[PDB]
Structure 1
Amino acid sequence: DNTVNIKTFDKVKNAFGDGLSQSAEGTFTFPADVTTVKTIKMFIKNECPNKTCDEWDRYANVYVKNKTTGEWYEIGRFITPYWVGTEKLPRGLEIDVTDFKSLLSGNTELKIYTETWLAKGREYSVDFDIVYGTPDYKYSAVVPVIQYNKSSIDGVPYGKAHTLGLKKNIQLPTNTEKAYLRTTISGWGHAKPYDAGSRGCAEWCFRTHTIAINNANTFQHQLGALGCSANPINNQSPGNWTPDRAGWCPGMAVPTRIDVLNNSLTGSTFSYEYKFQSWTNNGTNGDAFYAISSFVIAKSNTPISAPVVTN
């Protein structure tokens, strides 16, 4: 297994106000053949010497553009650490993006965004390690099921009525050999009523959501304690970095959840539904939202087309 490293963004800035952009885009060249790709890792480095950056814990994410549809697909999400950058981590934050190998090839458009509200913003460098070898499956295709993830407050309203579709029908190519879902979810808000411990939703309140397949509860996503106090990025004081949030920590990547689908669904049309654990916002302390992206990945040893997602 030979590994090649590809540099992309180099010290790009995400910032706000007076001629600035919270996002940055660029075109980069990746190798064209991915049939040999075993793994692809993305590394995000953020240098923030001397308190020169927006000091808050901000929502940030990276997308790749699907040339075929023109849509941006979220491939990685993280929360900036308080006060400092990723200096304690020699390579920066690491996120496995192998699932998107079909799009990471040739001339590729990437975009990086930070929900920063200050001119100091954050500055990043992003690189990818591509590992060649002999994969289980040579071919893969990926498509979104839902993407309500433009920002922390642009996600799905939690505890209030909304009009967003959370159910879809998915159709996998008949020659699919393996399929699975890739979900990234993170909550925002200190909304009341609080759970015990004064934990408001959706940032602090521990919840377990469910993915239903064909109407049967199939996968559970526990948004629990990751152990923020053990963050190797531990030079965040005086920021409130050590308490556990529900499913995330400041200065860490938001976890990627992979749910393997039953083969019996292959070459069929099935329903998908993301169900949030029941809760009602009393509205006395702000709102709550869950930012989520969920994609279906289909793999095969024969060339495969994209699954079809419909309402």
Structure 2
Amino acid sequence: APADNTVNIKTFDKVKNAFGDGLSQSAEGTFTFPADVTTVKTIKMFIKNECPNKTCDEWDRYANVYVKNKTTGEWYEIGRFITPYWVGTEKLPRGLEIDVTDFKSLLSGNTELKIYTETWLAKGREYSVDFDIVYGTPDYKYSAVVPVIQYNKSSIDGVPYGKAHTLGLKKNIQLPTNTEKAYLRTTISGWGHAKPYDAGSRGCAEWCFRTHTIAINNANTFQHQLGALGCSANPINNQSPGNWAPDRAGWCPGMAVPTRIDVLNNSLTGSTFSYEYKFQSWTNNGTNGDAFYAISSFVIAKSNTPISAPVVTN
């Protein structure tokens, strides 16, 4: 049979995210992706950060990429990473890799993308992003994705962690009746060294290890352990003198923030069910700054027959 092909799509080419008068922390652009995605098996996004000769904002910054929903105009976070300290991603020839297959329905035709870095220096960060589309035979011909929650405009725009009440994490999701497979895609990272510290002088939410929970129809169904990823083993090991090696809770400097995939029960199909993201209980005493969990959680619906995006309500 004709060999299944892989197409590479180049979009951002050495774009700069920076902070300054005539500068911008984000860069957006429209790129042409093939129109038909019915045979797309995988899409890999590669982010190359060019930071030669300490020419960039040397801090380990929060950064992310979005695809625009052509009809609603809403930006969906397709990938998130923390810039390495001092250097770029040169240690990785193709750059940081994040699977964005879940968004194949949005990556068709002239598609608008946005890349942001929470950079506060004019030096900023420079990137080049390309995508590999691998065609073959996906088990499901059609897919639809919609965000359940997105508190991710920046690290400090994440959900405040440790306050008396934490609202905005509960929604209702309505899956199409023709849904054959459904699952959640979640990306969460913590900011801050808020007190009280955990043993080991670990403040929240950057350093304190936590396991969060997703409850479906009130039943605790999935668990998200934000533990040690093994930052010392990071291939981008040229980050010193920055504090790159110790483990943060669920992330590392110079590494993509992990994508958590939770497969929903087929009994949920053709139903509206409750979704609730619950952070592990903690109370900020407010003596050492804030704590925030930048989070985006999407629900993907797949079927061999055309499927509309699931409906999310409060």
Same fold, TM exceeding 0.5?
Answer: yes
How far apart are residue 30 of structure 1 and its match? 0.1
Any gaps of 5 or more consecutive residues in structure 2? none
**What's 1:89 paired with?**
92
Alignment identity in percent? 100
The 5 A counterparts of 1:3-152 are: 3-152=6-155
CA change 1:162–1:24 in 2 (3 A) is: farther
The ranges of structure 1 where at least 4 consecutive aligned residues each deviate by more than 4 angstroms after the TM superposition are none
How far apart are residue 2 of structure 1 and its match? 1.0
How far apart are residue 164 of structure 1 and its match? 3.7
Tell me the SS of whatever aligns to 2:102.
helix
CA displacement, residues 43-86 of structure 1 (integer Å, 9 cap, x when unaligned): 00001110000000000000000011110000000000000000
Q: How far apart, in 2, do the equivalents of 1:240 and 1:135 lie?
A: 42
2:164–2:283: 8 Å Cα contact kept in structure 1?
A: no
How far apart are residue 163 of structure 1 and its match? 6.2
Tell me the SS of whatever aligns to 1:153.
helix
2:213–2:280: 8 Å Cα contact kept in structure 1?
A: yes
CA displacement, residues 222-263 of structure 1 (integer Å, 9 cap, x when unaligned): 000000000000000100000000000000000000000000
How far apart are residue 162 of structure 1 and its match? 5.3
The alignment covers a number of residue pairs equal to: 311
How far apart are residue 161 of structure 1 and its match? 3.7
CA displacement, residues 19-49 of structure 1 (integer Å, 9 cap, x when unaligned): 1100000000000000010000000000111
CA displacement, residues 67-116 of structure 1 (integer Å, 9 cap, x when unaligned): 11110000000000000000000100000000000000000000000000
Tell me the SS of whatever aligns to 2:183.
strand
Tell me the SS of whatever aligns to 2:256.
coil
Q: How far apart, in 1, do the equivalents of 2:54 and 2:168 lie?
A: 41
CA displacement, residues 264-286 of structure 1 (integer Å, 9 cap, x when unaligned): 00000100000000000011100
Once superposed, what is the RMSD of the aligned Cα atoms?
0.7
Q: How far apart, in 2, do the equivalents of 1:159 and 1:165 lie?
A: 14
TM-score, scaled to structure 1: 0.99
Q: Which moved more, 1:111-120 or 1:155-164?
A: 155-164
Tell me the SS of whatever aligns to 1:18.
coil
How far apart are residue 165 of structure 1 and its match? 1.2
2:146–2:299: 8 Å Cα contact kept in structure 1?
A: yes
2:160–2:166: 8 Å Cα contact kept in structure 1?
A: no
**What's 2:212 paired with?**
209
Q: How far apart, in 1, do the equivalents of 2:168 and 2:97 lie?
A: 31
Q: How far apart, in 2, do the equivalents of 1:161 and 1:35 lie?
A: 47
Q: How far apart, in 1, do the equivalents of 2:114 and 2:34 lie?
A: 19
How far apart are residue 160 of structure 1 and its match? 1.1
TM-score, scaled to structure 2: 0.98
